[PDB]
Amino acid sequence: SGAIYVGNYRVVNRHLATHNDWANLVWEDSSRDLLVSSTTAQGCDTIARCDCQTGVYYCSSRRKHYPVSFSKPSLIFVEASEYYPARYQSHLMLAVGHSEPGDCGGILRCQHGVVGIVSTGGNGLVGFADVRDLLWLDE
Numbered sequence: 001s002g003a004i005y006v007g008n009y010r011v012v013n014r015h016l017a018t019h020n021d022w023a024n025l026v027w028e029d030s031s032r033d034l035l036v037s038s039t040t041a042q043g044c045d046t047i048a049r050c051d052c053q054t055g056v057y058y059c060s061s062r063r064k065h066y067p068v069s070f071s072k073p074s075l076i077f078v079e080a081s082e083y084y085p086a087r088y089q090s091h092l093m094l095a096v097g098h099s100e101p102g103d104c105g106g107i108l109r110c111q112h113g114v115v116g117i118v119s120t121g122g123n124g125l126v127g128f129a130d131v132r133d134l135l136w137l138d139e
């Protein structure tokens with residue numbers, strides 16, 4: 001689990017969105033596993049606007065942060081789950097690192113701010129849903 005709080009928005013994995021998230025829906029994209037809902041309190045997370053390929057992510061299944069190198073956002077094949085059939089997920093970045101399904105939502109950050117959240121994994125790889133292109137999260 002985990003979310004990004006920026007301005008009047010909450011960014012979560014679309015497959016983990018709650019009833020309140022869907023009743024205050026701003027935008028969702030199944031192909032990216034993202035959902036954004038509106039909040040009443042103001043968030044102070046900063047979103048990165050960069051092309052970094054190094055950062056640190058939080059891994060709840062180890063209660064630890066790990067530094068990683070990660071690929072550029074792209075269309076990558078993701079195996080089936082209870083939430084989606086097997087498909088291409090877009091705007092996804094892979095890194096070599098530990099992750100389990102419950103790790104979804106852990107933040108990946110670089111020196112510029114929040115880059116994305118854990119969304120996929122398996123085989124010693126961890127995949128992050130990018131949020132750096134969502135310029136409207138700031139405006």
Ligand SMILES: Cc1[nH]c2cc(C#N)ccc2c1CCN1C[C@@H](C(N)=O)CCC1=O
Pocket residue numbers: 015033078081082083084089099100101102103104118119120121122123127
């Ligand atoms: C973060 C992670 N690490 C894993 C390791 C293993 C192992 N072994 C298995 C799964 C994972 C997952 C999450 C897989 N997943 C993908 C999500 C999506 N974005 O399509 C939908 C829900 C879901 O469970």
Ligand SMILES: [Zn+2]
Pocket residue numbers: 048049050051052110111112113
């Ligand atoms: Zn950066």
